[PDB]
Enzyme design. Structure first.
Site: not given
Ligand SMILES: O=c1[nH]cnc2c([C@@H]3O[C@H](CO)[C@@H](O)[C@H]3O)c[nH]c12
Ligand SMILES: O=c1[nH]cnc2c([C@@H]3O[C@H](CO)[C@@H](O)[C@H]3O)c[nH]c12
Ligand SMILES: O=c1[nH]cnc2c([C@@H]3O[C@H](CO)[C@@H](O)[C@H]3O)c[nH]c12
Lengths: 289, 289, 289
Positions: C88-89, C33, C86, C257, C243, C219-220, C116, C64
Site C-alpha cells: 500500500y506504500e 506496526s 507494504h 491507526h 483490535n 496487510m503484510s 499487527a 516503522h
Molecule cells: O484490522 C486491521 N485490518 C487490516 N490491517 C490491520 C492492521 C495492520 O496495521 C497497519 C495499520 O494499523 C497496517 O500496516 C496493517 O497491516 C492492524 N489492524 C488491522
C-alpha cells in the site's frame, strides 16, 4: 499499459503462418503441463518454434515445449500449442492469449483447452479427467483481465457473456465417447478455479477454494477461454487431475512440479486417445454440403 | 507507478471550473450505466465535456455521455457526472476517482453514487432500487486501491476507516421519501460487490459472490466511495437492478449490455423523481443560520 | 515489469553489510506496526538506516522506524528490521521482500515475522498473541506474487510448496515457552489473511473473510513468508491482535491507526520477553559439534 497488440499484429502473424503451411486447421488445441504428448498422434505434421513466429511469446515452463504444430488428428486438420504461457512467467494476459486471436483469424472454429490441475473435489483421484463445465476467475475479480482497455470491435463486443462458455453439446459428446472407450473410471466434470501462482496453495486456501465450490485449481486456461469466447470460438476443455491438494495441517507431504509424471507418462495413452476419438465432428460446420 | 496526480493537479482543475461557472454546488451526483437521464431535471444547467476540462479522463462506455453538468435540482445546486470511468476501460483507480477529489476542492459536501448492477439477492427484481448499505471490494483485496502509494495528508489520513461509508441518516431519509412516493414495490437495501470486468460473471462466480453475502454485483462505484470517504465527503448510493444474474447451468439466456433498456427507459421517471425529492436537505449544513 | 533485482543486487547488498559489521546473525526478525520496541533488548547493537544501505527500500509508515539493527538477543546473534515495507506504500512485492533474500545470503537460517492484525476470530481479545499456523494470500490469487517472472534457480525452484510454511517444531516451542512465562491468557493460533489496504475493512468484508476461515487480517507478512520459504528459510510468525474488527452495522466505532497504542505501549514488555525467551535454540544448527 493495456493490450499492446493491434488488430494488424494478429493479422500479420496469421498471414505469416498461412504463407508457410498448406494446412488450414478448424480445430485448435492447447496443451498444458505434461500433456505435450498429444502432438505425436498428428499426421503430416509441421512444427514451428514460437521464437520464429513474429509476435509470438515463449514458453519458459518445463513441460511446455514451445512449439506450434499443425497436423491431421484422426481425419481432422488442427493446430496445437505444445506448451502455453502463464501470468506467473511475467506475461500480461494480453500476451498470454495472443494465440487465441490468431487462431480466430486463421479460420479456426473450435478451441479445446487442457491443463493439469490440483483436485479439490474429494471424490477426484490422481489420474482423473475432469470436463470443465464452468470456471471461477479470481484474477478477473480484481480487473486482471485479457479484455481490459479499449475494445476491438473487430473481434467482439465490449461486454461478452461468460455463463455459456463451455459448449454443452461438446460435453455431451465427451461423455458418450468416454463410454465407448470402456473406461472403468467415470468421466469427471466440474468447476475450474484460476489463481496466479507460481507457488502452490496453503491448506487454508484449498479449503477456502473448495468452500467456494471449485472442483480443481490451476494457474491458466481461463484468460484463454475468455478471449476465445469473446471472438466467437466454440470452447471445450478438461483438466487432468495430477494431484490431490493438501487439505489438512497434518501434512503427509507437499505438492511439487513432479506432477508431469502423472501427465506425460501415467495418463498419456488415455487422454491422447480420448482427444483423438473426440475429433469425430463438431459436426465440422462448413457452410453447406 | 502509483497516483500520477499531485495536489496541484486537482487544485488547477477545480480553479478552471470555478472560473468558468457561477454555480457553487454542494451536492455531487455520479450517473452510472443508463442513468444519464438524471441530468434533464436540472435548471440553469451548464454542461462541460470532459475533454475540455484540463486533467479530466474520458468515458468510453455507451450509456456514459462524458459530460459534467452543473445545475439546480429541486432547489439544490449540484454538479453531475453524466457518465463515469471504469477500470475495465484501462483506467487506473487514481484516474477513475480524479473527479471525487476535484468535487471536494470545489466545496462539495455530499456525493451520491449510482450504478447499474446485477441482482444476486433472489428477492430482487429487474427494476428494483437497492440502497447500498455496504460493499465488498474485491480488487481492494489484492492491493488494487485508489489510495495506494504515498498519502496526501491534505486530503485525508493514511489508514481511513470504511465501516461507516454509507451515511445512516441519509439512508433513513431515502426510506422515508420512498414512502411518500407511494411506490408499490418496497425499497431494497444491501451489499454491493465490485469486480473488474468487463465480461459478465459465470454461474459459479455468481453463486460464490452470493455465498459471500453480496446482494448486487457491479464493476464500479467502490473506488469512488473510498476516495470520497477518505477526504470527508458524506456518501450515499444506490443500484438500479438492471438484470437477474444467471445462477443455474440450465442457462435460459445470458447477460448483455442491453440492460441500459432497464435504466434509460424503463425506470427513468422513477429514480429521477426519487433523486429529485431526495434533494430535500442534508440538512444543507452551511455553518450557521 | 517483474522483479527488477538481479542476483548480484542481493549479492552486493549482502557484501556491503558484511564489510560493515562483525556480527554474523543466524536469526532475522521483522518488526510490524508498533512492535519496533523488540530492538531495545539487543546487546552490542549496530544500527543502519535503510537509506544508507545500497538497494534498500524505505519505511514510510508511522510505527516503522526504517532501521536494520544487528545485535545479540538472549545469547543469539540476530538482525532486525525495525519497520517493514507494504504494498500500500506503492511498493511492488519484489521490492517489499528484497531484505528476505539478503538475509539468506548473509547466512541467516531462521526468520521470525511479526505484525499487527485485526481479530476476526470472536474468541480473540485485543492484546492477544496469535501464532500464525497458516495464511490465505488474497493478492496471490490474482497473480500479485513476489515470485512472478523468471525464476532465479540460485534461490529456489519454480513451483515451491507453501503447505508447510510455518515451522511445526517452532510452534511447539512457542507454546512450551508461553507456559513457562505463566501467562494467564492462553496462546492463540490461527490463520492470517492478507489484503492490500491501506483502508480498513467494511463489515461485509470482515464477515466474508471470517467465513473463509481467517482468524486475523493484515496487510503484510505473506509476501515475505513466500520468498523466505522459496529460499529455504525456516519460518515462524505471530500477530499481535491490536483490535477487534467491526462485524456489525450497528457500528459503535471504527478502526484507526491508534492501534500502535496496543503494541508499542500496551503489550510491549510481554512479547518482547516472549521473543527473547524464544531465542533458546533452533537448536542452532551449525553443521556439527
Ligand atoms: O484490522 C486491521 N485490518 C487490516 N490491517 C490491520 C492492521 C495492520 O496495521 C497497519 C495499520 O494499523 C497496517 O500496516 C496493517 O497491516 C492492524 N489492524 C488491522
Ligand atoms: O495443485 C495445483 N495447484 C495449482 N496449480 C496446479 C497445477 C498446474 O501445473 C503447473 C505446476 O505443476 C502450473 O502451471 C499449474 O497451473 C497442477 N497442479 C496444481
Ligand atoms: O450483472 C452484472 N454484472 C456486472 N456488472 C453489471 C452491470 C454494470 O453495467 C455495465 C455493463 O452493463 C458495467 O459498467 C457494470 O458495472 C450491470 N449488470 C451487471
Amino acid at each position: 499499459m493495456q493490450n499492446g497488440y493491434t488488430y494488424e499484429d494478429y493479422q500479420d502473424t496469421a498471414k505469416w503462418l498461412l504463407s508457410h503451411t498448406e494446412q488450414r486447421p478448424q480445430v485448435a488445441v492447447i496443451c498444458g503441463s505434461g500433456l505435450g504428448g498429444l502432438v505425436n498422434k498428428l499426421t503430416q505434421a509441421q512444427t514451428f518454434d514460437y521464437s520464429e513466429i513474429p509476435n509470438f511469446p515463449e514458453s519458459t515452463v518445463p513441460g511446455h515445449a514451445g512449439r506450434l504444430v499443425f497436423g491431421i488428428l484422426n481425419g481432422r486438420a488442427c493446430v496445437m500449442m505444445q506448451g502455453r504461457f502463464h501470468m506467473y512467467e511475467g506475461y500480461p494476459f494480453w500476451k498470454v492469449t495472443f494465440p487465441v486471436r490468431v487462431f480466430r483469424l486463421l479460420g479456426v472454429e473450435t478451441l479445446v483447452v487442457t491443463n493439469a490441475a490440483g483436485g479439490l473435489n474429494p471424490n477426484f483421484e490422481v489420474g482423473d479427467i475432469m470436463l470443465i463445465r464452468d470456471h471461477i476467475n479470481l484474477p478477473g475479480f480484481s480487473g486482471e483481465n485479457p479484455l481490459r482497455g479499449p475494445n476491438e470491435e473487430r473481434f467482439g463486443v465490449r461486454f461478452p457473456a461468460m455463463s455459456d462458455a463451455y459448449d454443452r453439446d461438446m460435453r455431451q459428446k465427451a461423455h458418450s465417447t468416454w463410454k465407448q472407450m470402456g473406461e472403468q473410471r467415470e468421466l469427471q466434470e466440474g468447476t475450474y478455479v484460476m489463481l496466479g501462482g507460481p507457488n502452490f496453495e496453503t491448506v487454508a486456501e484449498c479449503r477456502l477454494l473448495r468452500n467456494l465450490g471449485a472442483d480443481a485449481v490451476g494457474m491458466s486456461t481461463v484468460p484463454e477461454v475468455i478471449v476465445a469466447r469473446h471472438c466467437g470460438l466454440r470452447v471445450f476443455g478438461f483438466s487432468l487431475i495430477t494431484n490431490k491438494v493438501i487439505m489438512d495441517t497434518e501434512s503427509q507431504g507437499k505438492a511439487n512440479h513432479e506432477e508431469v509424471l502423472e501427465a506425460g507418462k501415467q495418463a498419456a495413452q488415455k487422454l491422447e486417445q480420448f482427444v483423438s476419438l473426440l475429433m469425430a465432428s463438431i459436426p465440422v460446420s462448413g457452410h453447406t454440403g
